[PDB]
Amino acid sequence: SHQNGERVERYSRKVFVGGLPPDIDEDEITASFRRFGPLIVDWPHKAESKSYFPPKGYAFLLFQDESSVQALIDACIEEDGKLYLCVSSPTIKDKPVQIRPWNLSDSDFVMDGSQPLDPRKTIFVGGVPRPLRAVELAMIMDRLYGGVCYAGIDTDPELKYPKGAGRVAFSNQQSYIAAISARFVQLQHGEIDKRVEVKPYV
């Protein structure tokens, strides 16, 4: 049978996992995923002090091609908050595995073309986690100090993946004056509530 033959490589091939069985090695997870082919993996624990593999289902991994990022993520279930794989089969059952890829091209939250990125109009925004997108950053500043032209989070040029804080670029009105002088505020959003930082760029 056939229905589609297109491919996409505009997703970040690094995927976090946590649903792995209580006993796992790199060949168990290589058999857990499909279409990913051969891949590279890293564990939160792998020292000779106990074992070459972690005592928990937590893992970080990536594979050789970026086209299977969309093919495998499409062969599984998703949520607006996270992804899930239906690989329940080995020593773990009835519970899908946690999945989190990244969007190496959505890391840019453009809002208006009247002002591109510039060192005299850039602003810094600190306190964002890595697993989140600039969603929480651009939306809070647009709900109380709106007028933004560009927004995003700090990333590694190595794989275009988050590494810490974030930034925005607008200088349109006193709304930017109100957020650049409001270097601490309250949001009650996600695992964060207060004292997030907002200051001029350097």
Nearest residue to 98 via CA among 86, 112, 84, 110: 84
Pairing of strands 192-194, 186-189: antiparallel
Residues 97, 54: Cα–Cα separation, whole Å: 16
Burial class (CB in 10 A: 0-12, 13-18, 19+), 143: exposed
Structure-derived torsion over alpha carbons of residues 16, 19, 20, 22, reported in degrees to the nearest 10: 130
CB 187 within 8 A of CB 174: no
Residues 101, 83: Cα–Cα separation, whole Å: 8
User: Which method, experimentally, gave rise to this model?
Assistant: NMR
* Residue 85: strand pairing partners: 97
* Residue 189: strand pairing partners: 192
> What separation in angstroms does the CA of 157 have from each of 13, 94, 201?
14, 38, 19
CB 96 within 8 A of CB 106: no
Domain 105-202 has CATH 3.30.70.330: yes
Where are the CATH 3.30.70.330 domain residues in the chain?
Answer: 105-202
CB 170 within 8 A of CB 150: yes
Region of residue 35 (left: phi > 0; alpha: psi -120 to 50; beta: else): left
